[model samples]
Target chain A: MVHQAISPRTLNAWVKVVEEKAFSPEVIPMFSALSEGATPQDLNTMLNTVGGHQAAMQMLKETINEEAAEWDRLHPVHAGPIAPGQMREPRGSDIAGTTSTLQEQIGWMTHNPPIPVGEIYKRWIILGLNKIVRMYSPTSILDIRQGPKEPFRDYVDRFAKTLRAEQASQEVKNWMTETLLVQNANPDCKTILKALGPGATLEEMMTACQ
Target chain B: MVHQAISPRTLNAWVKVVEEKAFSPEVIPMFSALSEGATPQDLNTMLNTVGGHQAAMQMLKETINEEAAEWDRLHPVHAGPIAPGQMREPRGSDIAGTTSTLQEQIGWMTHNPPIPVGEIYKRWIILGLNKIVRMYSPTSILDIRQGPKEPFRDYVDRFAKTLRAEQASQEVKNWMTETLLVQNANPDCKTILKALGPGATLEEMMTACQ
Candidate 1:
């Protein structure tokens, strides 16, 4: 099969990105060769002809390194690697905005490298998802506890957002809320939260607390 | 009885301070004579020795009226009318400056009609005390609950001031503290507060929370 050759300009750009330490040693030559004259069809054939799926992951791994800087700049890790000792959760607005921007940037970077940007975008989203999940861990939920004078409505609103970002299951969400969320609430407020009972929706809790 | 006679100037000042209401219907005749040349001792005797205590109180009432404009200008009441709605006992600081000035003003007013500025000063202080006590009430404590980022020490310090002002019993203070003071605290913070047990000094709670 006559695979399509990349332009010299695209070749140079690929080299620049790799030199920035985007990928590991094993994949650099693979990518560099691909950049110079190797085409998308050639890379695909090599992956299929080699150790099959395992071989494809090495290529996939290389593809990920190229977008490393883009991901780090977005600060999507919440309290995991980004803020281990700090006491704040990742904000919904930041998570939503960064992930969207990351997808957009990934859209462009994945083009000539031959890995569909769409594929990398999905992986990047997982990284972001981990961050979102980390911020709402049971321990972290307690960390996001309400402040003095913070209205019940506002605190519940924030808690609900973190739960949503964690992508918690309805059962997990309801259980967490009943057992953990209201564990430290005001006596009157605690009564209200507990009265929400099992099988109650987060929406119900939020509205009731208000 | 050789009681001292006040100057026309002093009498005029007293009359001006009380406006047309300075004297009682009975005492007005007495005061009219005195204003021309009446001494404070005569008024004191007439009010005290005769059946004039009631008459004296009436004059005392008017004297307070004269100072009413002065009191409003001082803005002595933090919550106004010494609100019993909010808890925060009246503070000496609130009274210190205002009462001192009030007494100083009373000193001058006491000279001619001899309304016993000392006596009036005590009553004014009671008003201030009531206001101070009113501020430190349970309802008021909740009103001033700390903000999210506010240091625990500061909130407790403020809360303690109110409690002391309320002159609440030690038992009552401790109970209100556990129940009301931490009602709006962070969820994790409530854990620490509960762990502190009963009779935790406000200072202890503050340091432990920090």
Candidate 2:
């Protein structure tokens, strides 16, 4: 079963292979840290602090490339007519071309196996990245939190910017963003935003805060 | 863009179609609620209260089947020799065969478009289900919270049972589960569990609580 796929020995060996590839140096330390007993939460915290999403994305793309190459190596096309009902091997181009997040791609791999070791390594890294990105994605207006000691005016500016960047359906965003802004604002700002009621705007709240 | 794929009008039309199929009655209310301004959090809360994971799973399988059927309808098999380097249409069989989660399947769809309306509906429902499942998956020991007025013994019993069901690597489970159990235990139990230190067992904690 997949649960038994990665023994400590196998993990150590794969780490060496990833290092030898040198396509993503950032991943090597992450693999080492995880192997040496770092929790996924610890990895999330570290990545958030260091702006590790780019590094994670780089690792993901490189890993996908490696997995694809390995897949092609394993299943070479032969000169013969295709048999009826014979399932064609899925193409690396199709897998890599998809617009899914690294986590989503890993999910696809999880469902379709025998999953390569490279794919397993990709999964570990992507899960940590997903946690960090979900919390702090520039587009997630609801997750916006007031900065420590920040002024209400500055908070409104940040909130408005985030709301503008939000990609949710307009009706959903319109219904929720103001409430979320109010909920996430500082104590004084919350009281003021609440007073502005259901149809409140960031501009009105900003004026009220001042 | 993908964000515009589900306008409010489109959403309503899709809801009507989903109802017509009637594969999952549980999903109809969810669709109605989202269109009528229910938040994803609201959906999660309702689902959690109603043991909606099974309902969500049922909806997911049905959605996948529908999406696959639609995909096949759009791209019928041609009677001819396959062209070199031409991408073969992704097979429904391959997609349905994957062991990935509904969210992951949706992720795969997201990357490969023009996504059908059926897929967008699936995405909305799956996202809500993912939120609920993540928070309350039986295997997630850390997410276990003590119930109000629940006895420490009962909480320990619940926690121990959950820890046993966790599918994470054994090393990870060993390192984290006891700490999570202590963390999630009631106030008095926390103090006693803390005193028992790193290698504390549930049996020891139960005795200490007594």
Candidate 3:
């Protein structure tokens, strides 16, 4: 992978992909910095200096404010305008602070010290992406049903991919993967996987199916 | 925002949007939980029980492995397969641990105690979203250029929106917003803003423009 210098232009292009929802295989390399030992703090600094830190910050603030507003609506007794200089405490603040209003608490939590880039990233970006993941991806072995008319090889590959993405221990993941693969396989493939036994790896199973 | 109970069906639909890269206004409510003060730990548990936690975890692992591989390519002498039980320490870990191989180091960092959902969200989702924000949003006042053909009212609205999104102190943001609005306004609007002086708020300016 080519290491490009982090520049305004590069950052701008990356943001465009995001705003446009144009994620593709080619754009995966744009995320290399985070994985390559770059501290979130360092990335934050870079973003502040040359990237869209402001817009991201604004977007984050907007989301938080919107949430707070909704929470207030649901709890109308706590809904009202916050007074200037009326500080509120965050969830685990050391100093006792006011929570007379939801806005005050949220305002203090987010704005008193101002939000860090890391926090903004988590609350806004990750939160958003997690929603997406929750919607589309198979969450369990039971969710990994083979589609009608899908070939055995294709199903094997999909099952392997899905299993690789599971959150359980390697032991659990392997067990579920093998069990589901065999259980969902076509009659012949099921026989072959069953004969190979439970200990066989997904690769071995795929090879056998082929 | 209507608060919906988190469920497998809801989570699945959300994940589909992400995998398909189809972000739109309608899906914004899916993110309300994080803002409504739902603890990351609680959200994680919910995700584990009825969400696409497995798929998200797998995607995260694949990302980390890819990064480690790239890091190894760049620093070949420190590259090799990690032995089972050959744990490495994460940054800032108290106990000293092996960093003999980049893979070992990254693997340990990610899987030692197993990465938490909060950490996963930060490293994967936030990091990806930050990339998008960096690309598309204006990071500073300097980046807020007015299009030549844009109407004055449109420019004022855009400028106000951009200013709201900026990361500066409210004082600084207000100052910059006012200054930039005056500086970037059409001759007629500029004269009006100048007469209104620096004390004029964005709303006042918009009213004046109207």
Candidate 4:
């Protein structure tokens, strides 16, 4: 029910504002005019006598509508992707430099200073972890697998890097167990792994499978 | 280093076993006797007194380890698939037949099953939704098209059911829009659907096709 009071001179300025679509700074004055007690009904009355009330009212209504829409635009749940400077290399405990648990790394990053770039804590953690994990030779389990075109040395080096980079023993154990299981299951390496037989240790692994 | 001891009689049995691979039920009594205070180091000491320490220790360790491996095999995380009476037809929020979001339906199904199926909730929900889905013309998205044996009504019914079953408006809208987009581009339906002009509704669908 807040109304705007306006002079003929100010009304003309609003008309130009509507025509130019300059609604931000310039329109604030128009809305300010409303705050000064110039009601829409009063403006319509004044413009009707001047033969421009309908158009003026139309513009005013549009101005009010668009302003309300800006409110909606301001609070969107997902504004889509980060803008420039939205993400920074995380610091402090967020730096997983030598941290152990992923949970701990996430906890460290969940604090202040890394200005939230409009995402859930999990996403921030992912971004933060990405920052920390990049320091390692290989950040993902997928990195352990030999590239189709990779040399045997390259593949072994990557596997060793993965074992060293990952902090969790269970994760390393799973990866190692999977690697050996797949190696032995392959009839090609199966012959060698089976030859290494019952208590296949790294010594036996290098002697043949390598 | 809490080592297990062994008697000379059993130590001789272990030596014979490593010499001959006979570590089986016959060896249980030999190991069960370790429930007494005998340690592997004690056995090694006794064998060392007889000047056969290395051979005796190796055979004893191997015998104990193989028995342990068998015990590990007997117990597993999951036994097998759910039993006959294990899963009941899901009710309440899980009933996706009339509900929309396939994702939420999946979430509800993913929770504690009528019994512990020891699986990802997505799969269980798939199972629960599968029951609800079976009530429809098609239980799977793979069944959306007209099969060689199916009639036209059956084919359309399946497609409509799929569209209705999914709760997401965007999913249904995307499908409908895609159907029209493809139909207009498809030589067969394009001619008729396109003839319905630039835009068509279910009203047009009945009028044009029916």
lDDT of 2 by residue, A1-210 (tens): 224333436444544534443233344445554544322222222222222245555544465556556545554644257564122333454344322222333334444543223233334444444443333333245556665556555576566666655555878876676667677777666766667664444443454453
lDDT tens per residue, model 3, A75-126: 3544257455444212211111112232333343345464222343333333
Grade the docking of candidate 4: incorrect
lDDT of 4 by residue, B82-123 (tens): 465234333221221222132223333333442212122222
Q: Which candidate ranks first by TM-score, i.e. highest?
A: 2
lDDT of 2 by residue, B58-101 (tens): 55445445445434433433436755422235434434323223
Per-residue lDDT value at A3 in model 4: 26
- Runs in model 4 lying further than 4 Å from the true structure: A1-143, A146-153, A170-187, A198-204, A207-210, B1-210
Q: Per-residue lDDT tens digits of candidate 1, residues A38-140?
A: 2223233332233323433444443334234234323223343643322122222222223323333233234343323333333433333232322222223
Error of 4 at A190 (Å): 4.6
iRMS, all models: 25.6, 19.2, 30.0, 29.7
2 against 4, candidate with superior DockQ: 2
Greater lDDT among 1 and 4 belongs to 1
Considering every candidate listed, which one attains the maximal DockQ? Answer: 2
lDDT of 4: 0.35
Model 3 DockQ vs. reference: 0.01
